[PDB]
CSV table of N, CA, C and O in Angstrom, one decimal:
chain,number,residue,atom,x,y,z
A,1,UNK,N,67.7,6.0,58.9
A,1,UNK,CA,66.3,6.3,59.0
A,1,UNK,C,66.1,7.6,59.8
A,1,UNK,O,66.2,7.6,61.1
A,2,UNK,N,65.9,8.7,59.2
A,2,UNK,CA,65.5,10.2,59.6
A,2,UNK,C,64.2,10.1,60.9
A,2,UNK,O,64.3,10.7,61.9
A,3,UNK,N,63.4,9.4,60.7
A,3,UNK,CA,62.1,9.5,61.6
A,3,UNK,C,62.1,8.4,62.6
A,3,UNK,O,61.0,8.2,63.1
A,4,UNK,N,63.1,7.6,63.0
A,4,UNK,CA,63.0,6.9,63.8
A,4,UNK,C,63.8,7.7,65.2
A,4,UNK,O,63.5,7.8,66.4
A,5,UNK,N,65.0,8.3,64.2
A,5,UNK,CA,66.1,9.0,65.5
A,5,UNK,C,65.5,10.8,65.2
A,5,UNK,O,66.3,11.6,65.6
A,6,UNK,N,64.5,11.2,64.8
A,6,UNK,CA,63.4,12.3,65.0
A,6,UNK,C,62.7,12.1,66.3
A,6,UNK,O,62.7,12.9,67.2
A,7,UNK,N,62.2,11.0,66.3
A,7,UNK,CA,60.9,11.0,67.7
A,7,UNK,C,61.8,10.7,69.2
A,7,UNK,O,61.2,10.6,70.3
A,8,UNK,N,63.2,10.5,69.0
A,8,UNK,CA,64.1,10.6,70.1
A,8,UNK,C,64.1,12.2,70.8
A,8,UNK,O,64.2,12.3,72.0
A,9,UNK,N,64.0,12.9,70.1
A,9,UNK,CA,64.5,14.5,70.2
A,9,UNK,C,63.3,15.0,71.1
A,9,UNK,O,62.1,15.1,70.7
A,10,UNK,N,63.8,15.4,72.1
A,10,UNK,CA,62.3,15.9,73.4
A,10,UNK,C,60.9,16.5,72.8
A,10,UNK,O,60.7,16.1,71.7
A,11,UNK,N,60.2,17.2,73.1
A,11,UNK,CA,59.2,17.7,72.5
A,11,UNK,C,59.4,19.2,72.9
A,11,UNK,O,59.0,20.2,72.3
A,12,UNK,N,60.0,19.3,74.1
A,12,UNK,CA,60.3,21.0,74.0
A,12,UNK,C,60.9,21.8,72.9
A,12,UNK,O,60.6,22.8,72.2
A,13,UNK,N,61.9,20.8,73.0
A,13,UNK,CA,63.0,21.2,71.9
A,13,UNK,C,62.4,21.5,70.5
A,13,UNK,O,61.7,20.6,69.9
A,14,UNK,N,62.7,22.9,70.0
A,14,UNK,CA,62.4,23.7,68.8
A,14,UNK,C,63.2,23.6,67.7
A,14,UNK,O,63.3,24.7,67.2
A,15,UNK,N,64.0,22.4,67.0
A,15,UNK,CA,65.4,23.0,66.0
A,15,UNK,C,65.4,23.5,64.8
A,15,UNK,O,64.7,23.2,63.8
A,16,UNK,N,66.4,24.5,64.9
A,16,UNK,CA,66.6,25.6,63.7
A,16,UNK,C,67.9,24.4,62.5
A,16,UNK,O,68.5,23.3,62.8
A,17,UNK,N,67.9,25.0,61.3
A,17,UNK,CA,69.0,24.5,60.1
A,17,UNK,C,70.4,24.5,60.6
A,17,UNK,O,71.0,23.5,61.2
A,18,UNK,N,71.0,26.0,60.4
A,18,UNK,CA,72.4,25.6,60.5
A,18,UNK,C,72.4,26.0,62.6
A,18,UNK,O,71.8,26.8,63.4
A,19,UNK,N,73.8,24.9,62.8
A,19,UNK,CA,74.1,25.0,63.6
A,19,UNK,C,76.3,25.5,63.6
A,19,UNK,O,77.2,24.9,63.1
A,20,UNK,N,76.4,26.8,64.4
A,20,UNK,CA,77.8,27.4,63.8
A,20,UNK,C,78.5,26.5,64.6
A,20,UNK,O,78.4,27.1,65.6
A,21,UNK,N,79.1,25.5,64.7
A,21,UNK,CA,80.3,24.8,65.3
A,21,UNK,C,81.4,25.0,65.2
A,21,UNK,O,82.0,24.5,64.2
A,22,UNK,N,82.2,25.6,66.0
A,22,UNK,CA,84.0,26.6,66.2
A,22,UNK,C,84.6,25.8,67.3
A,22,UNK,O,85.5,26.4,67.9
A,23,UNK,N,84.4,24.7,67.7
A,23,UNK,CA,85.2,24.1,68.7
A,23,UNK,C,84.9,22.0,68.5
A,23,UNK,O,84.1,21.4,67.8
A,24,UNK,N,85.7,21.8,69.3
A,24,UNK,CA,85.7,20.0,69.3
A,24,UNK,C,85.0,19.9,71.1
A,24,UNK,O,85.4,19.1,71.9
A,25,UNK,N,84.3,20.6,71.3
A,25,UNK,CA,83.5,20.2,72.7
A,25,UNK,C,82.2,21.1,72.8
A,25,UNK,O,82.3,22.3,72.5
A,26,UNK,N,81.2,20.7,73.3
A,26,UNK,CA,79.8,21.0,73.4
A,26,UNK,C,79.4,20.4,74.7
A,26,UNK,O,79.8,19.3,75.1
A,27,UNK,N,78.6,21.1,75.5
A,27,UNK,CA,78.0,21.0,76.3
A,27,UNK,C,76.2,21.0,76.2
A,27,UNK,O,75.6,21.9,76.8
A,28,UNK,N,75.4,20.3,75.6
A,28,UNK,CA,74.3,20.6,75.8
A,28,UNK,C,73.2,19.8,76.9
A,28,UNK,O,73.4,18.7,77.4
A,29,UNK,N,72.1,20.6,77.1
A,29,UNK,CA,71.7,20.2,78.0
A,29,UNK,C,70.0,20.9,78.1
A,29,UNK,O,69.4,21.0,77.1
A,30,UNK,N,69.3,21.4,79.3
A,30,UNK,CA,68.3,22.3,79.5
A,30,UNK,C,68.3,23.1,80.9
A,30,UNK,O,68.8,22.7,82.0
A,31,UNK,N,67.7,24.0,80.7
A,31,UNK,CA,67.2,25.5,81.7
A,31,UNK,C,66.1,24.8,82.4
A,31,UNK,O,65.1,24.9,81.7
A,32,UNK,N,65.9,24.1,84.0
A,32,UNK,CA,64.8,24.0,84.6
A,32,UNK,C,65.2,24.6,85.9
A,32,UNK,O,66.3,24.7,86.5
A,33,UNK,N,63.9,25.2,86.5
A,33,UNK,CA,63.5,25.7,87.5
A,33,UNK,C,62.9,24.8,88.9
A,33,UNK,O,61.7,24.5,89.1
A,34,UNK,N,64.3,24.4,90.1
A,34,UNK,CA,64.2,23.1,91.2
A,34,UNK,C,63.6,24.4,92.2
A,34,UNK,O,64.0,25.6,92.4
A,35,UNK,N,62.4,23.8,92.6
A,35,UNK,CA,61.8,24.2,94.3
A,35,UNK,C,62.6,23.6,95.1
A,35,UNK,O,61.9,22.7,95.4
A,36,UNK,N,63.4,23.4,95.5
A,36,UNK,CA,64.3,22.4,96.9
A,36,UNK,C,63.2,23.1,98.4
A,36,UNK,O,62.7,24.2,98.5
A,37,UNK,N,63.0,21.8,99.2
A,37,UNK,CA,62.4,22.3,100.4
A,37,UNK,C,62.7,21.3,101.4
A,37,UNK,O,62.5,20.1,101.0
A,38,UNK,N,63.2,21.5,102.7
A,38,UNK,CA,64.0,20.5,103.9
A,38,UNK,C,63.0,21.2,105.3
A,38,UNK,O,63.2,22.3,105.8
A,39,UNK,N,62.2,20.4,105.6
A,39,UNK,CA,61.4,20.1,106.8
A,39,UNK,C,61.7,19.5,108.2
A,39,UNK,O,62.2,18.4,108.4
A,40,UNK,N,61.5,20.1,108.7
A,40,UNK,CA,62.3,19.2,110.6
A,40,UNK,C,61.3,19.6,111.5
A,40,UNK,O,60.3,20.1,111.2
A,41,UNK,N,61.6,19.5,112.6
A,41,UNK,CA,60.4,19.4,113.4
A,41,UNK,C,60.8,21.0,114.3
A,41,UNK,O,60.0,21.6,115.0
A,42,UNK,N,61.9,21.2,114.3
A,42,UNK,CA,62.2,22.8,114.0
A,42,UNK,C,61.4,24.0,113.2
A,42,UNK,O,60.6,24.8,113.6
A,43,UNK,N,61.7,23.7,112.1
A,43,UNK,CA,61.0,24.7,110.6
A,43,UNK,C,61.3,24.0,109.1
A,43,UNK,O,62.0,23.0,109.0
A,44,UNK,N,61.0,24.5,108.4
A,44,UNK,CA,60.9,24.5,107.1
A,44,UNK,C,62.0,25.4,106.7
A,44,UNK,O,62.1,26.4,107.4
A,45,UNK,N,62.8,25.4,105.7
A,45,UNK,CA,63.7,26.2,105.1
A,45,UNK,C,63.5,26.1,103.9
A,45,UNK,O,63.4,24.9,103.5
A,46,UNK,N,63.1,27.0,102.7
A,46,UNK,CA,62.7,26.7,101.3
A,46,UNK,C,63.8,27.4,100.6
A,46,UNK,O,64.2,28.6,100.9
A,47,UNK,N,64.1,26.5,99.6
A,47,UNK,CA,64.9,27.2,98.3
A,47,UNK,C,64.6,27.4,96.9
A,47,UNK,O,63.6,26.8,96.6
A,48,UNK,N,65.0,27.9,96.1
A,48,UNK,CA,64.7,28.0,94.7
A,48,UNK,C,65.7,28.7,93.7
A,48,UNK,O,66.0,29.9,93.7
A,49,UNK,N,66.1,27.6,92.6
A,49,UNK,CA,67.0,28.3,91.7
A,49,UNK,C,66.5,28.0,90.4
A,49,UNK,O,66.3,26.9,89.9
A,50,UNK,N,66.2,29.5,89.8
A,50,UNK,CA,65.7,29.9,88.4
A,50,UNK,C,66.2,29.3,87.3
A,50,UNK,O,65.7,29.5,86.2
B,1,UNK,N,35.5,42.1,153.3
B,1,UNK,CA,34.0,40.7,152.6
B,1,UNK,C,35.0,39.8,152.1
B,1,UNK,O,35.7,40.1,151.1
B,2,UNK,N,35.2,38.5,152.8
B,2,UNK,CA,35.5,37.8,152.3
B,2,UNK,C,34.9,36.7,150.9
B,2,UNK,O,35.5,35.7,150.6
B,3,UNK,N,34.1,37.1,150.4
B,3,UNK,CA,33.1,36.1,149.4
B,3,UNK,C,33.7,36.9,147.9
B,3,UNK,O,34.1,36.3,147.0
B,4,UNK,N,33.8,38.6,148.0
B,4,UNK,CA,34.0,39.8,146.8
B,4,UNK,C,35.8,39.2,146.6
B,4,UNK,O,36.2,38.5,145.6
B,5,UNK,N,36.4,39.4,147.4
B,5,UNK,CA,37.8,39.2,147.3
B,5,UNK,C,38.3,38.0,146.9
B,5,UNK,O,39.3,37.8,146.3
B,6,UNK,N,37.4,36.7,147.6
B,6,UNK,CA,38.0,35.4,147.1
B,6,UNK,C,37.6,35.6,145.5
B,6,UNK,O,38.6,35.7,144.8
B,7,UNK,N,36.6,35.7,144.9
B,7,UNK,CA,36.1,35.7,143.5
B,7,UNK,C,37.5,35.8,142.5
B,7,UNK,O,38.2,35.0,141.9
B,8,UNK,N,37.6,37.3,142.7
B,8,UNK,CA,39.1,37.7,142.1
B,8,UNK,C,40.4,36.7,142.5
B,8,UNK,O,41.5,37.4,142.3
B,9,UNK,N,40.6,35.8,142.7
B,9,UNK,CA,41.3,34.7,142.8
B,9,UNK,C,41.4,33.8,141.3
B,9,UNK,O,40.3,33.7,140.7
B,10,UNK,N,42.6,33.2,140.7
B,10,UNK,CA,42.0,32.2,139.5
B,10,UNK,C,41.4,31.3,140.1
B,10,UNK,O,41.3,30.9,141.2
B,11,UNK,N,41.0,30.7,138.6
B,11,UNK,CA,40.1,29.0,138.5
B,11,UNK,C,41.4,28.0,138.9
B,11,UNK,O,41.4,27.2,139.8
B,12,UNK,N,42.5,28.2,138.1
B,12,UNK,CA,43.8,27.2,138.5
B,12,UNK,C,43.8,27.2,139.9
B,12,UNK,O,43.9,26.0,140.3
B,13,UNK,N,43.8,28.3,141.0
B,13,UNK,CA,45.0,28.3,142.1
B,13,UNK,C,44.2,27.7,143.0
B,13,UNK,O,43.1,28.1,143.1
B,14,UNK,N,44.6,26.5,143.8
B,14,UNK,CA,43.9,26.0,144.6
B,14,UNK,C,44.9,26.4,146.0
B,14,UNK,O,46.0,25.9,146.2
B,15,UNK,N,44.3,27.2,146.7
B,15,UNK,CA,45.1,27.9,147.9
B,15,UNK,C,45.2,26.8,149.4
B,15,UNK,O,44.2,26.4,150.0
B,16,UNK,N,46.4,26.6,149.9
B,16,UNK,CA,45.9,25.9,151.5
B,16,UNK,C,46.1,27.0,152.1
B,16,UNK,O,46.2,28.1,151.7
B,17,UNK,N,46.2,26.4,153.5
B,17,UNK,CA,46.2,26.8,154.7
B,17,UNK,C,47.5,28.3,155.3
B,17,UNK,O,47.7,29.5,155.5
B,18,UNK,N,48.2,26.9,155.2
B,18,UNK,CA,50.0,28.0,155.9
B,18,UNK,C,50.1,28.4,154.9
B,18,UNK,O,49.6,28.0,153.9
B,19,UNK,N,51.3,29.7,155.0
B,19,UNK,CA,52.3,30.0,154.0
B,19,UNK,C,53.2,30.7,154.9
B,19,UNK,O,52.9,31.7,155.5
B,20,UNK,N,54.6,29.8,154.9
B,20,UNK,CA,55.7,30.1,155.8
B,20,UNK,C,56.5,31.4,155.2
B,20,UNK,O,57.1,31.0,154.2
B,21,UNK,N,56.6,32.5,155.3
B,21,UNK,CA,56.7,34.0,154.6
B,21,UNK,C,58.1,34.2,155.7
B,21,UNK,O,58.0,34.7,156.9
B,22,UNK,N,59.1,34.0,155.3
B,22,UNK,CA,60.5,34.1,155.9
B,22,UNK,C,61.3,34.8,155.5
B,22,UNK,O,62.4,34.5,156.0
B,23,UNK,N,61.2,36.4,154.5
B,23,UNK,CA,61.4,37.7,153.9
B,23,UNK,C,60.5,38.5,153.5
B,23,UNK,O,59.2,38.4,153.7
B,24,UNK,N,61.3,39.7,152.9
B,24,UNK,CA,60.4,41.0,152.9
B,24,UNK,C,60.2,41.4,151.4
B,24,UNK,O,60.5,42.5,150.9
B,25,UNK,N,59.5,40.1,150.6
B,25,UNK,CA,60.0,40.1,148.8
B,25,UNK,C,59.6,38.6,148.9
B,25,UNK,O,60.0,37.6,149.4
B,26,UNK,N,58.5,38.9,148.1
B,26,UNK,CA,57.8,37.6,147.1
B,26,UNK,C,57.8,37.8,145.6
B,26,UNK,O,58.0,38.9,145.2
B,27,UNK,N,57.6,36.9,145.0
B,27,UNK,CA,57.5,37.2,143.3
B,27,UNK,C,56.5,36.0,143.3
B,27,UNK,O,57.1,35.0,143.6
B,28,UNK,N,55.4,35.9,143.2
B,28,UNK,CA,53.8,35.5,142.9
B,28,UNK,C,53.9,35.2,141.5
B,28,UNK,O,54.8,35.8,141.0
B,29,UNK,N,53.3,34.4,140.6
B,29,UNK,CA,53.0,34.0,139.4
B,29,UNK,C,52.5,33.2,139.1
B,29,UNK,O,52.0,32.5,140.0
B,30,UNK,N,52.4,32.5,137.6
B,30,UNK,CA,52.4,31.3,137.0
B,30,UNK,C,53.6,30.8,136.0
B,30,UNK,O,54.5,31.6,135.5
B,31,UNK,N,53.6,29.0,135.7
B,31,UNK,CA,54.3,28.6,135.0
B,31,UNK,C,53.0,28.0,133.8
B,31,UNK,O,52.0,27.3,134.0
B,32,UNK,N,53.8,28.8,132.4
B,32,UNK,CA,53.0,28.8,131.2
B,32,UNK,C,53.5,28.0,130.0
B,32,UNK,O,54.8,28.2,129.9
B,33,UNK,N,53.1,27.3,128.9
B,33,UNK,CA,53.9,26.5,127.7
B,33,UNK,C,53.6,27.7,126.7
B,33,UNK,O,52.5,28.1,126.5
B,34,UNK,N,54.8,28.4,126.2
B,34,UNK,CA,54.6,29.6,124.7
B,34,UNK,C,55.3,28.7,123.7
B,34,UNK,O,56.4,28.3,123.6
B,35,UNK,N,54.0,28.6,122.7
B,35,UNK,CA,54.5,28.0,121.6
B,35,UNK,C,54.5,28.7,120.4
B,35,UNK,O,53.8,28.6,119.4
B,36,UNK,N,55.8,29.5,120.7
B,36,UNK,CA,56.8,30.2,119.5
B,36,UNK,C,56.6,30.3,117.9
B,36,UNK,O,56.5,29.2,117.4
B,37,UNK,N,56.5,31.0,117.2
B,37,UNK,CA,56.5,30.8,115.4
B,37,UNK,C,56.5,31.9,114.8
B,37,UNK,O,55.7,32.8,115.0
B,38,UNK,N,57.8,31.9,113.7
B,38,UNK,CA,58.2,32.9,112.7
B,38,UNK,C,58.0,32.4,111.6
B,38,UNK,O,58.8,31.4,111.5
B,39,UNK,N,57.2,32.6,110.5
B,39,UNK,CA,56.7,32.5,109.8
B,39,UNK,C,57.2,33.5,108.6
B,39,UNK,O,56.4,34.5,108.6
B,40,UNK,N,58.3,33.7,107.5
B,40,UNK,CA,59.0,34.0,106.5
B,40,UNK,C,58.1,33.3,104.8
B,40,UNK,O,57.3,32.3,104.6
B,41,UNK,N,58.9,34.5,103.7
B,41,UNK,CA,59.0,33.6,102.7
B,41,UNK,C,60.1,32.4,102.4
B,41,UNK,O,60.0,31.4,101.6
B,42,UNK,N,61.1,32.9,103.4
B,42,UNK,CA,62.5,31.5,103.3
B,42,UNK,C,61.7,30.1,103.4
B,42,UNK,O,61.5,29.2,102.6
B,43,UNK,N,61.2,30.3,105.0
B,43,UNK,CA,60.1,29.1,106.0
B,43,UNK,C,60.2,29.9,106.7
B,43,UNK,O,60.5,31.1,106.5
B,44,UNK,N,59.7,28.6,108.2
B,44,UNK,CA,58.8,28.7,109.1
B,44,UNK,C,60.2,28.2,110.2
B,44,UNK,O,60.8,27.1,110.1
B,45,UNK,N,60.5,29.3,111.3
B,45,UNK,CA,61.6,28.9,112.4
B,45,UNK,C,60.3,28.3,113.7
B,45,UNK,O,59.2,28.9,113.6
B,46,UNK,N,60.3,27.5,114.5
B,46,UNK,CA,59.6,27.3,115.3
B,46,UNK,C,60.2,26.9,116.6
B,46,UNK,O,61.1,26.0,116.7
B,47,UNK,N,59.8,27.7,117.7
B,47,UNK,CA,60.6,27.8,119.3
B,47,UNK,C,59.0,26.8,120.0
B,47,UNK,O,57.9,26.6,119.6
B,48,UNK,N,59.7,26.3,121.5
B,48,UNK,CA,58.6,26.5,122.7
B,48,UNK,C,59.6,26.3,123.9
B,48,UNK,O,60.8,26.0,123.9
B,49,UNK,N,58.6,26.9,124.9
B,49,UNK,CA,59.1,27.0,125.9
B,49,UNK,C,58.2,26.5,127.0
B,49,UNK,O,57.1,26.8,127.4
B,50,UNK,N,59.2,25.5,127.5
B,50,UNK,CA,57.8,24.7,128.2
B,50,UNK,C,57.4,25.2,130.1
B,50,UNK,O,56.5,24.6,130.6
């Protein structure tokens, strides 16, 4: 069933036809952007990785 | 004129009587709380001194 294991597939995700496969291992995954932020009664320290 | 000169005195100092003066060198003052802050895009470092 095509449309059952369809509405599994995130909604970001855009997919194209062919996909070029040249190896027996894939990594996939997604690009998100973490605010990290650690509070004490010292200061605040803030991070961020794009 | 004693009335002109006391004025110029602070609101804090409540003065007595003696003051036993046993050298030729005083250092006069107050004890104050500074409450410290550096303020960054990283954070915020925060000092006091009591």
């Amino acid at each position: 069933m095509s449309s059952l294991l369809n509405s599994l597939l995130p909604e970001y995700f855009k997919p194209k036809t062919n996909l070029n496969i040249n190896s027996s291992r894939v990594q996939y995954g997604f690009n998100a952007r973490i605010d990290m932020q650690y509070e004490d009664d010292s200061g605040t320290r803030k991070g961020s990785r794009p």
